[PDB]
């Protein structure tokens, strides 16, 4: 069954405002250590952060708790499978937290057009 | 299983124009009796209408009929759970229809960024 | 069970520019023979193309491959039922591929608000 569904919209310009405001700190707050390794070489760094920000917020909604406790930005990682499809990877605290509530899997889709970045998330079982 | 899915996006500015054109005749058309009673006390009347308009349209698509018969604006209500998350409530005629179609529950996800309000709906079983 | 999910946002302006750039060849490249046959009767030709473009991209994401091989613009058709519900129709190469992956069904929803066109897709099994 569907445990929950989630969506989030992120403006590129809002990310730009947040970058200026918090400086380095924002990305360091949103991105996981794994994600932070490749961020400096990101061809479109604004899109990179926007994608992660939308996906994690959408994730938090779909799991029904919001960014709280184990469900934290640093625990929710966005990676890609062999064919380039984006997938969630979880920190150990957050990986385990899901089992407890019976959440088996969380699917992700992301898209962008100009200033708008959209994340679509569905949690199963 | 999935009975159907639905989505709709609404511009806050479009809502403002619709209010301009029709007055409350627009709100009277889109809102349920329950919503219409509490609408005057809405802190954000434009955002209030935008959410209702998007969610109801997305609902109608998800059940595969569009606005038709019991699947009407006045039968599709949007309330909020204790945690403040939007959720659907139904006029008795629509509740009966959903049971007939074997739809067990209809999930609702909502997002907003600036001028854009987005609703995604999944009708289950 | 969910095989995968997909979403895509398309600007009408992007379609207009593509149409200017490539002329008729664009529609011929994006649309299936059935879609192309009915294209001249479209009430809003630009929206007609924009919707198909988004839906096909969202489909391709949901099946996890992106536009590649049998998962192609030519093979991914969008039609509407009697009640106006959008549905996918497949060239024989694609329906063959879907059965091989065990993908039983693929649901679709489309919406638009001014310049923004949006598609949501969920592939089951």
3-state SS string for C81-94:
CCCCCEEEEECHHH
Q: Which residue on chain A is closest to C122 by alpha carbon?
A: A122
Contact B54, B48 (CB under 8 A): no
Q: Which residue on chain A is closest to C57 by alpha carbon?
A: A111
All residues at 6 or more sequence positions from A104 whose CB lies less than 8 Å from its CB, including other chains: A3, A124, A125
Residue ranges of the domains in chain B?
Answer: 1-125
Contact B109, B120 (CB under 8 A): yes
Chain C residues with CB within 8 Å of chain B CB: 81, 83-85, 105, 107-114, 116, 118-120, 122, 124
**CB within 8 Å: C61 and A114:** no
The partner residues of C118 in beta bridges, in order of sequence, read: C9, C111
Query: Which of C105, C28, C29, C23 is CA-nearest to residue C67?
Result: C29
Q: How many CA atoms lie within 13 A of B64 on its CB side?
A: 16
Domain C1-125 has CATH 1.10.760.10: no
**CB within 8 Å: A113 and C9:** yes
Token pair of B19 as six digits: 């209010």
Helices A45-62, A12-22: crossing angle, 10 deg rounding: 100
How far away is chain A from the Cα of B111, in angstroms, using its nearest Cα? 5
How far away is chain A from the Cα of B71, in angstroms, using its nearest Cα? 22
All residues at 6 or more sequence positions from C88 whose CB lies less than 8 Å from its CB, including other chains: C55, C59, C76, C77, C78, C79, C106, C108
**CB within 8 Å: A111 and C62:** no
Name chain C's partners: 3 or more CB pairs within 8 A. A, B
Comparing CB atoms, the residue among A11, A64, A122 nearest residue B113 is A11
What are the distances in angstroms from CA C113 to CA A75, B38, B78, B117?
35, 27, 21, 10
C112 assigned ligand-binding residue: no
Query: What is the Cα–Cα distance from A58 to A42, expressed in whole angstroms?
Result: 22
Contacts of C118 in chain B (CB under 8 A): 7, 9, 118
Where does chain C have alpha helices with state H?
12-22, 24-30, 33-38, 45-62, 92-101
Contact A88, A74 (CB under 8 A): no
C124 assigned ligand-binding residue: no
For residue C56, count other CB atoms closer than 10 A to its CB: 28
H/E run at residue C47: helix C45-62
Comparing CB atoms, the residue among A1, A7, A11 nearest residue B120 is A7
DSSP secondary structure code for residue C31 in this structure: S
Query: What is the Cα–Cα distance from C71 to C93, expressed in whole angstroms?
Result: 9
Contacts of C65 in chain A (CB under 8 A): 83, 85
**CB within 8 Å: B113 and A62:** no
Comparing CB atoms, the residue among C11, C64, C66 nearest residue A114 is C11
Helix, strand, coil shares, percent, chain C, to 5: 45, 30, 25
């Amino acid at each position: 069954m569907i445990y929950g569904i989630g969506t989030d919209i992120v403006s590129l310009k809002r990310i730009i405002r947040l970058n200026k405001k918090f400086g380095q700190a924002f990305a360091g707050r949103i991105l996981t250590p794994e994600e932070l390794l490749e961020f400096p070489q990101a061809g479109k760094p604004v899109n990179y952060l926007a994608k992660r920000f939308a996906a994690k917020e959408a994730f938090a909604k779909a799991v029904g708790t919001g960014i709280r406790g184990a469900v934290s930005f640093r625990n929710i990682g966005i990676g890609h499978d062999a064919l380039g499809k984006p997938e969630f990877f979880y920190g150990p605290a957050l990986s385990k937290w899901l089992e407890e509530q019976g959440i088996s899997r969380v699917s992700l889709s992301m898209s962008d057009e100009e200033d708008t970045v959209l994340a679509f998330v569905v949690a199963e079982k």
